[PDB]
Amino acid sequence: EYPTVNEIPVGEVRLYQIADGVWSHIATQSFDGAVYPSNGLIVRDGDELLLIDTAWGAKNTAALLAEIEKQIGLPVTRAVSTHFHDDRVGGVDVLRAAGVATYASPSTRRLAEAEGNEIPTHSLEGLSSSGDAVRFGPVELFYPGAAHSTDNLVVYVPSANVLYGGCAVHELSSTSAGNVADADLAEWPTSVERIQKHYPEAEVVIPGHGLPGGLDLLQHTANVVKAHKN
Ligand SMILES: NS(=O)(=O)c1cccc(-c2ccc(C3CCNCC3)cc2)c1-c1nnn[nH]1
Ligand SMILES: [Zn+2]
Ligand SMILES: [Zn+2]
Known part of the structure; x- marks a missing residue:
C-alpha cells in the first residue's frame, strides 16, 4: 500500500504510518524533465513532531505541513535535513516562515550555501567524523561517512527500530x-557497512526514494553502487 510515483501528482503529499509515532512523508517532483518520488520522516516527540x-x-513542503495538520494534528517544531540537495533542503524557507526550527550539520550547511540551496538555520555539531552519533529528540543522527554525498546523515528511531537512510x-x-x-562511489560500500554494524536491530529501512523494506536495502545499495562503478 506504499504510494508510488504515478499515484502522487506533483504538489500533493502523502503520509504513511511506519510504526507507532513514526511516519514517512512521500512527495513527487520534476527534475531535469523526469518525475521522481521522494521520502522523508516524521517522528512523534511527545506533543510535538520532529521532521x-x-x-x-x-509548494510540496507547504502541502506537507497541511497534510500533517490534517492527519496528525501535532505541531512540527524542528526539522533536520540529511544532506544539502534540494530533495532535503528545498522548502526549508517554508518551514522557517512557519516557525519550524531547521537544523543540519555544518557540512550540509556549507554545501547548501555553495550550491545556492536553502540553508537550515542551526548547525548540528558532533557529526563530522564517520561513525559519529548524536541524539536529537526521539531519534539518533548518524554520520556513516561519504556515500551519496559527503555530508549524508542517516536517522534511527530507537523506540521503533526504524532506520531512515535518506x-x-x-x-x-x-x-x-x-x-x-x-x-563517493568507493567509500559508499564502507559507509553502508558502518550502518549495518551500528544498526543490526533495524526492522524497517526507508530509502530516500521508493519503497521501505528491511535490512536487505543496505546490501542492495552497496551492490547497486558497485554495478555503477563498473
Ligand atoms: N538528492 S539529488 O539531488 O541527488 C537527486 C535529485 C534529483 C533526482 C534524484 C534521483 C533519485 C532517484 C533516482 C533513481 C534511483 C534508482 N531507482 C529509480 C530512481 C534517480 C535520481 C536525486 C537523487 N537522490 N538520490 N540519488 N539521486
Ligand atoms: Zn542528493
Ligand atoms: Zn535524493
Missing part, C-alpha cells in the same frame, strides 16, 4: 545509482 527532510520544494540508501527495485555527481 526529517523537506518534501522537495516550496539518499545513501536505495530501494530494492533500484537498478541504477541515481545522481552520483556528488557521491
Whole structure:
C-alpha cells in the first residue's frame, strides 16, 4: 500500500504510518524533465513532531505541513535535513516562515550555501567524523561517512527500530545509482557497512526514494553502487 510515483501528482503529499509515532512523508517532483518520488520522516516527540527532510520544494513542503495538520494534528517544531540537495533542503524557507526550527550539520550547511540551496538555520555539531552519533529528540543522527554525498546523515528511531537512510540508501527495485555527481562511489560500500554494524536491530529501512523494506536495502545499495562503478 506504499504510494508510488504515478499515484502522487506533483504538489500533493502523502503520509504513511511506519510504526507507532513514526511516519514517512512521500512527495513527487520534476527534475531535469523526469518525475521522481521522494521520502522523508516524521517522528512523534511527545506533543510535538520532529521532521526529517523537506518534501522537495516550496509548494510540496507547504502541502506537507497541511497534510500533517490534517492527519496528525501535532505541531512540527524542528526539522533536520540529511544532506544539502534540494530533495532535503528545498522548502526549508517554508518551514522557517512557519516557525519550524531547521537544523543540519555544518557540512550540509556549507554545501547548501555553495550550491545556492536553502540553508537550515542551526548547525548540528558532533557529526563530522564517520561513525559519529548524536541524539536529537526521539531519534539518533548518524554520520556513516561519504556515500551519496559527503555530508549524508542517516536517522534511527530507537523506540521503533526504524532506520531512515535518506539518499545513501536505495530501494530494492533500484537498478541504477541515481545522481552520483556528488557521491563517493568507493567509500559508499564502507559507509553502508558502518550502518549495518551500528544498526543490526533495524526492522524497517526507508530509502530516500521508493519503497521501505528491511535490512536487505543496505546490501542492495552497496551492490547497486558497485554495478555503477563498473
Ligand atoms: N538528492 S539529488 O539531488 O541527488 C537527486 C535529485 C534529483 C533526482 C534524484 C534521483 C533519485 C532517484 C533516482 C533513481 C534511483 C534508482 N531507482 C529509480 C530512481 C534517480 C535520481 C536525486 C537523487 N537522490 N538520490 N540519488 N539521486
Ligand atoms: Zn542528493
Ligand atoms: Zn535524493
